Design a protein around this ligand. Structure first.
Ligand code: A1A58
Ligand code: CL
Length: 167
């Protein structure tokens, strides 16, 4: 039993809700919140910009030190950093950004990072400003993640389409 509330159950392990991931994280304070990161951890907009803003830019400061030490992530890769005031940890995961021409096949590799964590709050990888089809992202999530994932979808119209079209 966990403290996630109001989610629709899609499969044994995948749950979905129309919610702002920032407000969800502040309420639940999950062990792991997933960020929709880029390889430079530049949290400018989309999910990343919103999460970073909610940390008063502390996420960005921590991220800049991480990059200065380690260099950029790989597309499909991840790193674990602090969750600041939002969660114990933030798993920064880089899905392919279609608006940069990145290979959508890497979306499965990106979701594989979730399997290293028993329970996660997450957005749909490569959705929004990363330019992939969210219906496809949900499909890959369901077919790749085996740990317990609680998906927050910001747009109510999109949430309804994901549920009604879910196979
Ligand atoms: O599944 C994540 C959905 C799809 C798209 F990627 C953006 N999005 C969000 N969901 C909840 N809160 C959010 N805050 C900022 C963005 C955002
Ligand atoms: Cl977005």
């Amino acid at each position: 039993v966990n403290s996630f509330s109001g989610y629709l159950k899609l499969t044994d392990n995948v749950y979905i809700k129309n919610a702002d991931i920032v407000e969800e994280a502040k309420k639940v304070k999950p062990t792991v919140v997933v960020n929709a990161a880029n390889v430079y951890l530049k949290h400018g907009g989309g999910v990343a910009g919103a999460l970073n803003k909610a940390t008063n830019n502390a996420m960005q400061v921590e991220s800049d030190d991480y990059i200065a030490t380690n260099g950029p992530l790989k597309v499909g890769g991840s790193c674990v950093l602090s969750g600041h005031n939002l969660a114990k940890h933030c798993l920064h995961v880089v899905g392919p950004n279609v608006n940069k021409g990145e290979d959508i096949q890497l979306l499965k590799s990106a979701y594989e990072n979730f399997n290293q964590h028993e329970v996660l709050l997450a957005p749909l990888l490569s959705a929004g400003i990363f330019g992939a089809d969210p219906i496809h992202s949900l499909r890959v999530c369901v077919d790749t993640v085996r740990t317990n994932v609680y998906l927050a979808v910001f747009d109510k119209n999109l949430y309804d389409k994901l549920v009604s079209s879910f196979l």
